[PDB]
Amino acid sequence: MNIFEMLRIDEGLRLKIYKDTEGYYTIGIGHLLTKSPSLNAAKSELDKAIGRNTNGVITKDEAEKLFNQDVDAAVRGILRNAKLKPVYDSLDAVRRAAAINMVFQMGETGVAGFTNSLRMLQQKRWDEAAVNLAKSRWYNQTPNRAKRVITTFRTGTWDAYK
Ligand SMILES: [Cl-]
Ligand SMILES: [Cl-]
């Protein structure tokens, strides 16, 4: 298991513009196109992202190229963020994958607001972090995904994903 296979389980793969759990236009492997209610705005964001006239459909290769860029972008966002980077550096390889999953889902700014959880993760207080991570809109809106990510931070294994 790795970050790619993890996010592929959590996000799915859809080759046509769809709305995500929040109602936002999305395509591929959780690639958010726009928060705007306009499907025309989505299509135009999609065209720009892929570099051709898509009419709201992309191929598998194209969904995987977006995925690759997005995983890369989430890593680079962790490493440039003063609050995330120290936590990430302190973690083992499995729990690093959990931190990436969270940033991919909710952005660097969102994860950086989990101030208390980040401190507990940094101190390696796993059971405590997991309890605090769960007291969140994140956990209440997407409980099954959030449980898998929280289990990863708690155990340091891929058990929630097998
Ligand atoms: Cl893009
Ligand atoms: Cl969920």
**CATH assignment of the domain containing 40:** 1.10.530.40
Cα–Cα distance, 33 to 39 (Å, whole number): 10
32 is annotated as contributing to ligand binding: yes
Cα–Cα distance, 131 to 38 (Å, whole number): 38
Q: What residues are labeled active site?
A: 11, 20
Residue 27 in 3-state DSSP? Answer: strand
Beta bridge partners of residue 31, listed in sequence order: 27
Residues with CB under 5 A from ligand 2 (ion): 142, 144-145
Experimental approach taken: X-ray
Q: Return the H-helix or E-strand segment holding 143.
A: helix 143-155
Shortest CA distance to 120 belongs to which of 79, 80, 82, 90?
A: 90
- Which segments of 1-142 does DSSP mark as H helices, in order? 3-11, 39-50, 60-80, 84-90, 93-112, 115-123, 126-134, 137-141
Shortest CA distance to 55 belongs to which of 81, 96, 27, 34?
A: 27
Q: How far is the CA of 154 from the centre of ligand 1 (A)?
A: 32
By residue range, what is the domain housing residue 12?
A: 1-162
- When divided into structural domains, the chain yields a total of 1
